[PDB]
Structure formats: structure tokens, C-alpha cells
Amino acid sequence: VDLGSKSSNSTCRLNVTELASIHPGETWTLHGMCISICYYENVTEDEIIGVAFTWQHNESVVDLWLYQNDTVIRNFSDITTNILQDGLKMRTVPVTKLYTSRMVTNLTVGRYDCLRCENGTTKIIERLYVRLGSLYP
Amino acid sequence: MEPHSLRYNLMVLSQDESVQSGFLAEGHLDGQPFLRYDRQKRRAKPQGQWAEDVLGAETWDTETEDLTENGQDLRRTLTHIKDQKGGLHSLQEIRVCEIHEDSSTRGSRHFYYNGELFLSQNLETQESTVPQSSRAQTLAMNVTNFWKEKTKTHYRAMQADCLQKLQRYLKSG
Ligand SMILES: *[C@@H]1O[C@H](CO)[C@@H](O)[C@H](O)[C@H]1NC(C)=O
Ligand SMILES: *[C@@H]1O[C@H](CO)[C@@H](O)[C@H](O)[C@H]1NC(C)=O
Ligand SMILES: *[C@@H]1O[C@H](CO)[C@@H](O)[C@H](O)[C@H]1NC(C)=O
Ligand SMILES: *[C@@H]1O[C@H](CO)[C@@H](O)[C@H](O)[C@H]1NC(C)=O
Ligand SMILES: *[C@@H]1O[C@H](CO)[C@@H](O)[C@H](O)[C@H]1NC(C)=O
Ligand SMILES: *[C@@H]1O[C@H](CO)[C@@H](O)[C@H](O)[C@H]1NC(C)=O
């Protein structure tokens, strides 16, 4: 699967096996909550961006959803736990946000990597680890 | 045990057909003020010693951007409310999210025109409620029609924003 923008000559072939070793722009962990909100400036019409999900319990098991031209072009393979899995464009600044909100279960714990192609290489702009736990402190 | 909560209170004003520049805003966390908005500097700022010294300073960068987006949206909405009467008019939005002791969440927004509730929306279910009055119905039709011209995504994203912030603020304390 390809990410990035053909018009900007910045396309990258996704290799999920390489994601673990990529240094993310920002990285954090939530316990008992799965809400990832990734911030993309100056997204072009043809640019494919998205979110990879690597299961906590098997690093080889990776899901993906993809966004292009303000529409979801690929859902997670399992959407039953999804509360929100879509993008939106802000009005006051030229920013597109990708929202991934899911029920936290033994099947959604893991690593969520917000992806972008830059100069034909895969970047991770934000990485969120999700773990079980009590939302209420 | 009472739920944890994050509450935003924004207000915009109009007179003689012109929506004033800027907006008013405040935020409360678990019932206590933590956020104020400097309308001149156009900056969210801490309210109280706890918000000043405990919350990360990045809090105010994020809140400034988020309030600006919300406040400009509210200015736009007021522009499209039909009211040709003179005088100072106000549109206020109260937005709240909660985390309950059983770890479940709630979220809603409520709109007041000249102090009168005319529309409430449940941000988790997308259900809207309008008071039984001819005036409130007219106002709510006015607003909801303007919005019509990603609805579900829009409302759920507001809830996601709020919940993410609440979780972060609770951790800091
Ligand atoms: C994906 O990445 C791994 C690690 O670099 C590499 O061994 C493998 O050859 C790559 N797969 C493809 C199809 O390029
Ligand atoms: C996006 O594009 C605008 C207009 O060209 C430019 O001013 C701005 O710096 C760009 N944003 C970023 C963060 O690259
Ligand atoms: C993006 O979507 C719009 C429809 O909303 C369409 O008119 C436009 O051609 C699309 N752009 C591309 C490059 O697909
Ligand atoms: C992890 O996933 C890979 C790829 O599906 C599979 O080959 C492997 O058996 C799994 N390992 C475990 C311990 O579940
Ligand atoms: C993603 O899932 C939604 C809900 O089932 C569906 O409406 C939409 O067509 C799906 N999109 C794709 C590209 O599979
Ligand atoms: C996984 O979680 C579900 C609830 O989502 C629960 O019913 C099930 O027992 C769990 N299974 C394991 C092996 O943890």
C-alpha cells in the first residue's frame, strides 16, 4: 500500500515491519483510553495519510486506516470497537486532524502510529500507546 | 463519587447586525475555574495557582488554538440567527464532558440566546433536544439549518477533543 502525494512527488510504499524503529515526532501512553488526534498541516488534495495499529500482543498483527481528499479510503479491518475513525479540516488554520477513538479492550491495546510520507520516506508524526486501565483515577 | 468534568463556557455578542470581534471564554475542571481567556491578547491563560504551576505551559497553546476555532464558529452561528431587534444580543455555548466512577463518559453542548436555552446536543449519541417553545424552536431551526448548509464526525470530534484534554488535566494534578 502507498502513502503520500503523487503531485508532490512524495510517495512511499508502506512497510509495517519498519514502523517500530522509526522515531516519532511525539510519543505517549494512555491507560484506559484510546483517543488519538493527529495534527497535519498543509495536506494536499491527493495526499494519502493514515493511522497504523500494531496489536500489543503480537507485533506482527497490524491494521491500517487511510484518508485522502477529506474521505476515508480504507477502514480498519475491524471497526466494531470504533467510536470515531475519520478526519476533519479546521476552519481557522490549514490543519487536517485524523481522529481515532475506540473502546479500550484486549483487542485494541497496542501502538497507534499516525503516518505521513516526506521526501519519499515514511514518517510517524505521533505515536500513541494504549493500555488497559481505569479511566476514572 | 462525583464524575470528573471539563466545562467550557463561550459567549459571542452582536449589536445592530454586527457580530463583535472576538469572544469571551472560561473553563472549569471538576467544578473549579482553571482557564480564562484574554480577549485582547487573544490568549487562553491559567486561572488559579494550580493551573498556573501544575499544568504544563503547552496547555495554553493548545487551548488558545481550540478556543479560537470554537469561538469563530460561534461568531459565524450568531451571524446567521435572524434577529432584527436593536440592543446587545448574546449567544453562549456551554460544552461539557465527564468521566464517571464506572469509567464511562458523557458529553453535551448547550446553546443560550440572550440567556435562554434553545438547543442541547448529546455529543455521544448525536441526539438533539429543543425546549417546547415557539421562540426556542425558531432559534434552533435557524442554527441547525445553517449547520446543515461530516456532521457525525464533527460532533464526535468535539467529544474526543474534550475527553483527551480532561484525561491529560487529571493526570497532571
Ligand atoms: C520490510 O521491512 C523489513 C525490515 O527492513 C525488511 O526486512 C523487508 O524486506 C521489508 N519488506 C519489503 C516487502 O520490502
Ligand atoms: C502551509 O502553506 C501556507 C501557504 O503556502 C504557508 O504559509 C505555511 O507556512 C504552510 N504551513 C506549514 C506549517 O508548512
Ligand atoms: C477531491 O474531492 C472533490 C470532491 O469533493 C473532487 O472534486 C476533487 O476532484 C478531488 N480531488 C482529487 C485530486 O481527487
Ligand atoms: C503473531 O502474528 C503472526 C502473523 O500473523 C503469526 O505468524 C504468529 O504466529 C503470531 N504469534 C503469536 C504468538 O500469536
Ligand atoms: C468504512 O466503513 C463505513 C461504515 O461501515 C462505510 O460506510 C464505508 O463505506 C467504509 N469505507 C471503505 C472505503 O471501506
Ligand atoms: C477480552 O475482552 C473481552 C471484553 O472485550 C472479554 O469478554 C474477554 O473475556 C477477554 N478475553 C481475554 C482472553 O482476555
What is the set of domains in chain A, with CATH numbers?
1-137 (2.60.40.1990)
What is the DSSP secondary structure assignment for residue A113, as one 8-state letter?
E
Distance A96 CA to ligand 1 centre (A): 30
Ligand index nearest the alpha carbon of residue A19: 1
Cell of A31: 491507560
Q: How many domains does chain B have?
A: 1
Cell 462525583: give the residue.
B2
Cell 475519520: give the residue.
A86
The candidate with the shortest Cα–Cα distance to B116, out of B135, B95, B129, is B135
Rounded-to-5 percentages of helix, strand, coil across chain A: 5, 55, 40
Residue B79 to residues A90, A136, B5, B14, B119, Cα–Cα distance (Å): 19, 40, 30, 8, 17
Residues of A in contact with B42 (CB under 8 A): none
Answer left, alpha or beta for residue A84, where phi above 0 means left and psi between -120 and 50 means alpha: beta
* Distance between CA atoms of residues B120 and B93, nearest Å: 10
Strands A27-31 and A121-131: parallel
* Distance between CA atoms of residues B17 and B10, nearest Å: 20
| Dihedrals phi, psi of A47, to nearest 5 degrees | -75, 125
Contact B160 A88 (CB under 8 A): no
Q: Are B73 and B65 in contact (CB under 8 A)?
A: no
The candidate with the shortest Cα–Cα distance to B160, out of B110, B97, B109, B68, is B97
What technique was this entry resolved by? X-ray
Cell of A21: 524503529
Q: Are B125 and B53 in contact (CB under 8 A)?
A: no
Ligand 5 pocket mutation pick from A1, A72, A76, A85 by most atoms within 8 angstroms of CB: A72
Residue B150 belongs to domain spanning:
1-173
Distance A55 CA to ligand 6 centre (A): 15
Q: What is the DSSP string of B39-66?
A: TTTTEEEE-SHHHHHTS-THHHHHHHHH
The candidate with the shortest Cα–Cα distance to B113, out of B165, B78, B80, is B78
Question: Longest C-alpha distance within chain A, in Å?
Answer: 48
3-state secondary structure of B22: coil
3-state secondary structure of B159: helix
* Distance between CA atoms of residues B71 and B29, nearest Å: 19
- Find the CATH number of the domain harbouring B63: 3.30.500.10
* Distance between CA atoms of residues B131 and B112, nearest Å: 11
Cell of B51: 493551573
Resolution (A): 1.8
* Distance between CA atoms of residues B50 and B35, nearest Å: 11
Contact B103 A32 (CB under 8 A): yes
Cell 488535566: give the residue.
B169
Cell 476555532: give the residue.
B69
Which atom in ligand 1 lies closest to the alpha carbon of residue A15? 1
Q: Does B94 touch chain A (CB under 8 A)?
A: no
Ligand index nearest the alpha carbon of residue A15: 1
Contacts of A9 (CB under 8 A, 6+ apart): A120
Q: What residue spans of chain B are helical by DSSP H?
A: 49-53, 58-79, 134-148, 151-172
Q: Are B60 and B74 in contact (CB under 8 A)?
A: no
Q: Are B35 and B43 in contact (CB under 8 A)?
A: no
* Distance between CA atoms of residues A9 and A63, nearest Å: 26
